[PDB]
Amino acid sequence: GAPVLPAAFGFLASARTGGGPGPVFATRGSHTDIDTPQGERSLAATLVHAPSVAPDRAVARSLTGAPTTAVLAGEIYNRDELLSVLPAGPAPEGDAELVLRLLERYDLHAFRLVNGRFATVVRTGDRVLLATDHAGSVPLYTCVAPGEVRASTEAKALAAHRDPKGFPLADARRVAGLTGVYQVPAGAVMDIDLGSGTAVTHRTWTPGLSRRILPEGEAVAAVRAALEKAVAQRVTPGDTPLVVLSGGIDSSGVAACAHRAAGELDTVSMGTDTSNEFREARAVVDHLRTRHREITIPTTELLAQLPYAVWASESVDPDIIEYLLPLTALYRALDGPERRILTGYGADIPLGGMHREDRLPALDTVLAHDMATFDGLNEMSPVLSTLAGHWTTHPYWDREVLDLLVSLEAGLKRRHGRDKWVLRAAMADALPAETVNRPKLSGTTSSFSRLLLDHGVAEDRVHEAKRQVVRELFDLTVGGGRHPSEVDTDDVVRSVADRT
Amino acid sequence: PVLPAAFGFLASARTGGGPVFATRGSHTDIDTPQGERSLAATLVHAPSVAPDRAVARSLTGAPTTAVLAGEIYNRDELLSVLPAGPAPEGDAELVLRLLERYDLHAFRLVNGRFATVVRTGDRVLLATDHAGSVPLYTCVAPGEVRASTEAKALAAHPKGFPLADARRVAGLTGVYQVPAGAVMDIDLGSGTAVTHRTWTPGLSRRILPEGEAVAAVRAALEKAVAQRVTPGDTPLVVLSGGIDSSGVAACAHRAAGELDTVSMGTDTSNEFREARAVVDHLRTRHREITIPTTELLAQLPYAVWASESVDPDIIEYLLPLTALYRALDGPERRILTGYGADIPLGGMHREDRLPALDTVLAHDMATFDGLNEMSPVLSTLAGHWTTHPYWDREVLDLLVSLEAGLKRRHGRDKWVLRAAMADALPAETVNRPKLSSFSRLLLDHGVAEDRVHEAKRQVVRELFDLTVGGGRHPSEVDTDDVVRSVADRT
Numbered sequence: 001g002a003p004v005l006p007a008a009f010g011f012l013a014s015a016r017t018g019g020g021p022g023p024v025f026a027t028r029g030s031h032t033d034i035d036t037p038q039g040e041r042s043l044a045a046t047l048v049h050a051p052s053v054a055p056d057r058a059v060a061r062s063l064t065g066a067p068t069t070a071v072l073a074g075e076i077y078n079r080d081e082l083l084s085v086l087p088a089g090p091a092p093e094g095d096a097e098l099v100l101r102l103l104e105r106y107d108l109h110a111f112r113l114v115n116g117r118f119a120t121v122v123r124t125g126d127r128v129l130l131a132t133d134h135a136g137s138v139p140l141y142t143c144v145a146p147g148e149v150r151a152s153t154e155a156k157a158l159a160a161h162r163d164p165k166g167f168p169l170a171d172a173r174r175v176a177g178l179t180g181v182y183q184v185p186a187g188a189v190m191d192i193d194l195g196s197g198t199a200v201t202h203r204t205w206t207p208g209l210s211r212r213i214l215p216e217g218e219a220v221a222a223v224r225a226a227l228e229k230a231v232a233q234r235v236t237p238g239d240t241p242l243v244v245l246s247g248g249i250d251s252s253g254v255a256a257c258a259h260r261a262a263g264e265l266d267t268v269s270m271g272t273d274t275s276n277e278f279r280e281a282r283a284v285v286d287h288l289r290t291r292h293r294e295i296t297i298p299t300t301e302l303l304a305q306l307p308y309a310v311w312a313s314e315s316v317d318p319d320i321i322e323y324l325l326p327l328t329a330l331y332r333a334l335d336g337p338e339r340r341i342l343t344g345y346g347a348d349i350p351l352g353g354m355h356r357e358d359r360l361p362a363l364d365t366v367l368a369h370d371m372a373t374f375d376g377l378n379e380m381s382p383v384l385s386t387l388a389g390h391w392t393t394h395p396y397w398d399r400e401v402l403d404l405l406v407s408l409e410a411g412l413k414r415r416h417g418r419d420k421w422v423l424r425a426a427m428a429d430a431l432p433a434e435t436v437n438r439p440k441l442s443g444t445t446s447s448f449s450r451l452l453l454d455h456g457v458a459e460d461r462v463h464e465a466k467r468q469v470v471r472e473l474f475d476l477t478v479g480g481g482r483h484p485s486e487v488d489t490d491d492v493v494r495s496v497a498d499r500t
Numbered sequence: 501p502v503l504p505a506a507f508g509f510l511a512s513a514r515t516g517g518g519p520v521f522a523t524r525g526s527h528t529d530i531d532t533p534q535g536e537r538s539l540a541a542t543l544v545h546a547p548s549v550a551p552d553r554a555v556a557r558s559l560t561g562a563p564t565t566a567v568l569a570g571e572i573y574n575r576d577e578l579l580s581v582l583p584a585g586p587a588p589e590g591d592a593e594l595v596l597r598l599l600e601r602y603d604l605h606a607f608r609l610v611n612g613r614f615a616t617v618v619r620t621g622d623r624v625l626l627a628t629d630h631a632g633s634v635p636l637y638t639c640v641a642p643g644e645v646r647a648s649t650e651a652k653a654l655a656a657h658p659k660g661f662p663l664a665d666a667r668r669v670a671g672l673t674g675v676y677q678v679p680a681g682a683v684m685d686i687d688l689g690s691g692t693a694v695t696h697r698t699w700t701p702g703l704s705r706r707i708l709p710e711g712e713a714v715a716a717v718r719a720a721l722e723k724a725v726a727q728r729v730t731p732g733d734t735p736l737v738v739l740s741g742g743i744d745s746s747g748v749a750a751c752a753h754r755a756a757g758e759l760d761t762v763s764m765g766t767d768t769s770n771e772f773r774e775a776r777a778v779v780d781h782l783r784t785r786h787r788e789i790t791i792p793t794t795e796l797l798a799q800l801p802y803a804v805w806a807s808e809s810v811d812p813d814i815i816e817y818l819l820p821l822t823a824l825y826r827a828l829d830g831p832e833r834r835i836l837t838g839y840g841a842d843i844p845l846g847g848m849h850r851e852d853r854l855p856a857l858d859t860v861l862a863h864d865m866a867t868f869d870g871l872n873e874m875s876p877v878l879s880t881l882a883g884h885w886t887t888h889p890y891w892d893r894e895v896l897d898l899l900v901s902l903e904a905g906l907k908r909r910h911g912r913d914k915w916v917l918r919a920a921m922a923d924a925l926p927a928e929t930v931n932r933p934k935l936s937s938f939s940r941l942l943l944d945h946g947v948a949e950d951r952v953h954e955a956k957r958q959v960v961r962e963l964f965d966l967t968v969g970g971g972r973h974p975s976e977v978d979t980d981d982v983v984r985s986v987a988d989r990t
């Protein structure tokens with residue numbers, strides 16, 4: 001009875017003094033322009049959303065008949081908490097309206113209260129607000145100049161224009177490979193004066209730098225409770241969600257929580273002609289009695305996802321692109337209706353899932369560095385899945401779960417010789433023993449690294465070779481306006497190798 | 501011990517080459533086992549305490565020496581993450597045990613009121629508590645690291661490269677103040693430093709129903725105060741008629757089972773009547789001290805000398821507090837204050853509309869570092885130790901995080917704190933809302949508005965260059981002439 005997918009996946013909005021640009025998105029869906037009642041003084045916007053579901057809940061307007069409009073891509077998770085701090089009403093219907101009602105009470109500080117997965121733009125008179133969620137999980141880009149502000153959930157839609165009129169902004173980073181396009185920082189709200197094109201940015205969240213010791217038993221129960229809540233908030237009542245499942249504790253944990261929340265669950269696992277964790281996942285599938293699907297794709301197909309992954313994430317970090325190849329392939333391979341998907345992605349970051357020794361200092365060093373450098377990588381962008389029409393959400397990076405996991409002392413993250421111990425302990429009563437204490441996972445190269453090595457690229461120049469390949473795929477797809485389908489990936493890789 | 505093992509220090513680590521503090525107390529130079537290649541230091545402490553617990557040594561990793569000024573409050577928590585069972589002697593040793601397990605990240609775990617310097621081999625660590633409540637300064641050059649809890653001891657000296665992530669002390673040269681909530685990792689040989697922040701104000705806000713918010717605030721304050729009260733010893737609370745100090749008084753009384761209070765007044769105003777209500781409700785041993793406005797202003801050079809602050813507004817807040825600590829009679833005391841509660845709770849906010857409350861809150865939290873308004877020297881200059889419950893790391897994190905509607909609610913300021921103490925204080929106290937001698941001084945010497953706030957900055961800066969920069973005792977500074985010169989200079 002309730003909408004299973006967000007009211008809108010993305011948008012291209014515009015606020016200009018005068019004038020009057022068809023959006024090109026990687027995100028799949030209907031393109032619907034919102035009404036512009038105040039004419040040139042209104043906020044113009046094209047929303048990309050789930051076909052057949054009108055995007056009404058992604059737009060909100062003034063209740064006093066004034067020039068104030070808000071557009072929101074994504075969704076909010078702590079709705080009951082937010083509803084509890086609002087005056088008489090009326091009861092907001094949709095997240096854009098919830099945001100607007102909150103802005104009426106706290107102005108821009110409203111964003112310090114929201115725990116969600118969204119990107120939003122608001123125009124009030126000649127003031128424009130742009131805001132991201134705490135982790136910038138829904139990328140938001142902008143082109144600001146005196147008299148005109150353009151904002152979009154995909155940089156490519158802003159670059160599609162001839163020489164975007166975008167200039168430097170406080171806290172906003174210039175997008176490499178593009179001109180005039182800047183990315184709004186994660187956990188922030190930019191307050192823009194339309195006339196001058198100047199902006200003041202306020203951060204609404206930042207990774208904790210301190211660590212808090214809690215009674216052991218309590219810490220473990222707290223992690224389980226927070227994960228259970230975050231997952232429940234992400235599951236639509238009346239709809240059985242899909243969990244992308246691996247053999248690891250991360251995705252297994254989300255599956256256990258999701259099954260409890262929905263009463264039933266669907267799971268899917270992807271594998272290649274070289275490796276898979278089908279047996280490991282089946283252990284959880286049988287334990288939970290889920291409707292499971294196994295998908296095997298040749299390595300040539302997985303690597304064929306290179307341009308799609310770059311095009312969707314608009315990221316140029318080769319390491320990140322590699323993590324995304326498998327997921328990009330999985331989302332495109334799914335058959336049937338558009339799904340609400342939950343993943344165990346991200347757990348490794350605050351927990352130092354890569355740490356491999358009992359010594360704790362290096363774990364905190366890496367963790368702190370990771371939390372200070374995730375912004376701009378766009379690794380959890382919804383476009384990765386929406387390019388195929390599916391919505392994805394990541395429980396481990398829920399603001400409450402994230403704050404808690406980041407804050408725990410290192411001895412809880414690496415213990416008894418096991419990685420992410422606190423998470424394994426938190427779920428030890430909901431999963432089979434083998435899943436709970438099976439090590440995270442020696443000479444094995446990634447298929448992307450293998451691809452360059454198979455081209456005869458010296459192994460010490462492979463990583464830089466991968467960086468150059470991605471860089472060129474970005475220039476063709478995001479900067480050039482070329483569709484992934486039109487990219488001769490082989491030629492690109494061959495070219496980079498021939499110059500290495 | 502009722503007082504910390506050390507109030508402050510002047511330390512150094514170099515190759516092989518005393519101090520004068522505002523802090524009142526004994527001086528003890530620690531042993532130098534490794535000779536010229538060890539950590540040399542002069543600790544200033546209460547005559548009644550052994551400085552031993554303020555120094556710890558070990559051979560773990562390399563010859564190591566730690567010096568710590570102040571104290572740690574979440575000791576039980578810290579002890580819970582350590583191996584074996586040989587409990588540390590004091591806080592300096594506790595830090596050393598933590599460093600062995602988490603290295604510099606150990607500081608991300610500490611909730612205290614301290615400043616510490618550690619030398620392990622040719623590596624030097626300089627660390628402050630989350631709020632930098634105990635100022636720490638340093639001079640860093642290749643082969644020479646000097647650290648002090650008072651810039652004045654470092655100003656009295658020649659060399660000291662620029663430290664990027666730290667702030668230069670006003671007027672002084674080569675002297676830097678270690679940022680709050682940070683640990684500076686220095687390589688002695690190269691004189692290069694890397695600074696890691698171990699705490700930062702939360703920017704997000706939390707939503708909680710009244711009942712839970714009220715209960716959490718009460719529980720957090722009770723704990724932070726219990727941690728600050730020595731078992732067996734009755735503490736002293738500097739009490740005004742306000743909810744902040746009253747809230748601390750109620751918690752300290754509960755924790756100590758007894759309580760000593762003191763309120764100060766001037767010939768201009770006082771809150772003796774307001775405080776009396778609380779004095780009787782908790783039945784404490786109360787004392788009222790009235791200081792002439794003339795004596796209040798005479799504190800100008802003492803407050804600058806002790807706080808080493810150049811901020812006129814902060815200096816004015818500190819004049820009465822400084823007069824009070826110096827006027828206290830009897831033995832050295834462990835004192836708790838309700839200072840700082842207005843910052844995270846937006847105590848100065850006067851409207852029901854919330855936007856401005858959060859704007860000022862975020863700004864205040866991003867700019868408190870360097871003001872030194874809660875420095876222990878303000879009270880130790882008179883032998884007394886102060887600690888501030890509201891800026892306890894746990895209490896602070898909680899109060900800062902609360903959504904504005906819990907701070908301004910039912911038309912009352914700092915609502916959640918008032919509600920949290922409702923069942924421990926008289927109704928009038930929790931219900932009475934929150935609601936310049938210095939200025940009057942300058943106006944007497946001739947100076948217009950828009951020229952007074954400015955002139956005050958010049959007076960404060962002059963006193964600083966004299967007492968902190970020139971190593972001249974406050975008792976030797978004519979605050980009358982300082983005003984004179986600065987007066988006929990605008």
Ligand SMILES: [N]C(=[N])[N][C][C][C][C]([N][C][C]C(=O)O1[C]([C]2O[C](N3[C]=NC4=C3N=[C]N=C4[N])[C]([O])[C]2[O])O1P([O])(=O)[C]P([O])(=O)OP([O])([O])=O)C([O])=O
Pocket residue numbers: 737738739740741742743744745746762763764765817818820821824836837838839840841842843847864868871873933934
């Ligand atoms: N940083 C920033 N931004 N700011 C800062 C500011 C500060 C504030 N406050 C104000 C000033 C002061 O001083 O204050 C405090 C404390 O101290 C003490 N005292 C005072 N006075 C006095 C005292 N004692 C005794 N006597 C006299 N006279 C106390 O303890 C306190 O706590 O405070 P206040 O605020 O002023 C008062 P209260 O008490 O708190 O109450 P209410 O409620 O009215 O407020 C801050 O702190 O923040």
Ligand SMILES: Nc1ncnc2c1ncn2[C@@H]1O[C@H](COP(=O)(O)CP(=O)(O)OP(=O)(O)O)[C@@H](O)[C@H]1O
Pocket residue numbers: 243244245246247248249250251252268269270271326327330342343344345346347348353440441
């Ligand atoms: N082959 C595959 N099949 C199904 N889902 C997959 C997958 N590879 C990755 N995922 C999803 O993408 C996320 C990224 O995660 P990874 O860290 O690489 C494995 P993990 O499932 O998190 O377990 P682990 O990190 O404890 O080993 C997972 O949480 C999972 O939901």
Ligand SMILES: N=C(N)NCCC[C@H](NCCC(=O)O)C(=O)O
Pocket residue numbers: 323344345346347348349353354370374377379
């Ligand atoms: N942003 C980063 N620093 N890293 C993102 C990596 C994504 C990571 N999965 C792979 C496991 C690993 O090798 O860390 C995760 O947290 O799901």
Ligand SMILES: [Mg+2]
Pocket residue numbers: 248250251344345346347348353
């Ligand atoms: Mg993982």
Ligand SMILES: [Mg+2]
Pocket residue numbers: 742744745838839840841842847
């Ligand atoms: Mg106060």
